[PDB]
Amino acid sequence: KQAIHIDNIYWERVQLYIEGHSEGVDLTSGQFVLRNLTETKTLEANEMKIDGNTFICRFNVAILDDGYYLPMDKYLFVYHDQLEYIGQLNPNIIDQAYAALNEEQIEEYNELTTQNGKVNYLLAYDAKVFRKGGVSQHTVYTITPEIASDVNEFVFDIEITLPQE
């Protein structure tokens, strides 16, 4: 097919880095963004490095509580040119996540029921949690990569809560 692929995900302090490549999309004219499923909040990348068909993008997700925010919101990684392209997760990441312990192995096989819950459990090992201080309200940011079963697409499940919760 022709789509945007997500190859690696990592963090430096609060900044979320997304590395990937294109399988047919021209990357020189389009804007990479994080967009929620409801199309009501969009987050632009602060850094965008293109190298041939490969790309790296940086997002500062910590600004999402500066305005009006939902405490349970899933965000797609999308390349917007003339058509929006939703990033697809590389199966190598889930296969490397499968390289777990024995306890974790039998824990993952207790999922059983749905394939979705299995892949989400494998992806949860790369979740990020941090707090925002120096302000009037200290908030906990929890960003969890997962496959959204409502659309069958990869999303960052972000929940912004108070420490009390």
The residue assigned the tokens 């990592």 is 10
Q: CA-to-CA distance for 126 and 9, rounded, in angstroms?
A: 8
Q: What is the crossing angle of helices 115-123 and 102-109, to 10°?
A: 150
Which pair of structure tokens corresponds to residue 18? 């997304």
- In degrees, to the nearest 5, what angle opens at C-alpha 8 toward C-alphas 3 and 9? 110
Write out the DSSP string of 97-130: HH---HHHHHHHHTT-S-HHHHHHHHHGGG-EEE
- In total, how many domains does the chain have? 1
92: helix, coil or strand?
Answer: helix
Angstrom CA distances, 95 to 88, 118, 156, stand at 15, 12, 19
Q: Are 45 and 58 in contact (CB under 8 A)?
A: yes
What method did the depositors use to determine the structure? Answer: X-ray
Nearest by Cα to 37 from 84, 80, 76, 83 = 76
Range of the domain at 18: 4-161
Q: CA-to-CA distance for 16 and 144, rounded, in angstroms?
A: 12
Give the DSSP letter of residue 163: T
Q: In sequence order, what are the residues at sequence separation of 6 or more whose Cβ sits closer than 8 angstroms to the Cβ of residue 55?
A: 19, 20, 21, 22, 27, 32, 48, 49
Q: Where are the alpha helices (DSSP H) in the chain?
A: 91-98, 102-109, 115-123
